[PDB]
Amino acid sequence: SSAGPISQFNYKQSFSNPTCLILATVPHNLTTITKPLKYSYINKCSRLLSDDRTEVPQLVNANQYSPCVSIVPSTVWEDGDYYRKQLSPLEGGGWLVASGSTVAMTEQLQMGFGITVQYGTDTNSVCPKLKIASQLGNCVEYSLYGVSGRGVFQNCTAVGVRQQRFVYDAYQNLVGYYSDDGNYYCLRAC
Amino acid sequence: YVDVGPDSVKSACIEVDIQQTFFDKTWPRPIDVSKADGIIYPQGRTYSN
What we know:
This is part of a larger assembly, with 2 copies of chain A.
Chain A: H1 5-10, E1 19-25, E2 38-48, E3 55-57, E4 82-86, E5 95-104, E6 110-116, E7 154-155, E8 185-186
């Protein structure tokens, strides 16, 4: 719910999907994450029409980059720097114009995370994980990939295919290992 | 569509001699399913002994 430069010219989430926004701080303990010279953001992105008078802000659309990322360096050299680029008659004529802002780097690097989730109809294949949903549930129940069932898994040996991941015994039933990673949890009836 | 690398820049093709009679041989290797010749394992599931 903000009409600052960030939503205008830098980063916009979708309003049609559920979204989250996370502010964090890398400790010291985390060392593979390197800091840059400073924090930079775009504080102006507009077009000057071919009439040399009309200024039209170029707003960023969700899931896209600013049209000004072509002229704004990956880090802004100095607070308030401005960028320009004349447009070809095909591009519309006039100019493209931008201005960058800076904030001083911090002791510990500070980051931003934006998450966007889509709930599908049947394709909900991005789920959490824990460890009951896994071993050692050495009694009833399991619920594997497209198959239901109630079984007592045991570390058995050693009969199967091992590349696709069930084993049946001459009927609809599965007797029964696979799937675990990677062993032989042969199942039984209730 | 996918980039599959450049077109050939050659202006001709290599000449090809077709001589079917040189390839007409009898080297029989018939299906013997006793030895499981030509068997696709079943897709739906997999099995033991």
